[PDB]
Design a protein around this ligand. Sequence first.
Ligand SMILES: OC[C@H]1O[C@H](Sc2cccc(Br)c2)[C@H](O)[C@@H](n2cc(-c3cc(F)c(F)c(F)c3)nn2)[C@H]1O
Length: 138
Amino acid sequence: PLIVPYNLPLPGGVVPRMLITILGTVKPNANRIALDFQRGNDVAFHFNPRFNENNRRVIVCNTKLDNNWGREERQSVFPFESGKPFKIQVLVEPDHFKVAVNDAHLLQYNHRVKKLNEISKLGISGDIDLTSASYTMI
Ligand SMILES: OC[C@H]1O[C@H](Sc2cccc(Br)c2)[C@H](O)[C@@H](n2cc(-c3cc(F)c(F)c(F)c3)nn2)[C@H]1O
């Protein structure tokens, strides 16, 4: 494969029990990946693996409101590897997004943007070959 950056519409927004699955392969020498769950121009949930931030690998999560980034939430557990296939699962739960990579729980991100049914796009960007992006209800 799909063209990156990729826009996955989320019709009617998100809701608890909605599971998003992204399959792809990290490029060689990757620098960054981003998932952006968007409410119009706002980013309700930005999930941003950084492969080299001051020679450390970190996942940065945040929200963008009126073009302003908020307080970052950082996770040093880093399950991505340059050149390797991955699976990201984002499960919408009532009070957070719950993210697992390669079937292992990674992090939760508490809902800052509370109008879940207005979070109606997912952008997928960065240094990946994107194989598929889809959703289902569990
Ligand atoms: O807080 C989160 C943000 O941090 C910095 S801005 C910043 C600086 C200091 C303190 C605080 Br608070 C915020 C970022 O520049 C910002 N970002 C990343 C991408 C991006 C685009 C792509 F196309 C892509 F592929 C990708 F992977 C990422 N766009 N914007 C976002 O990550």
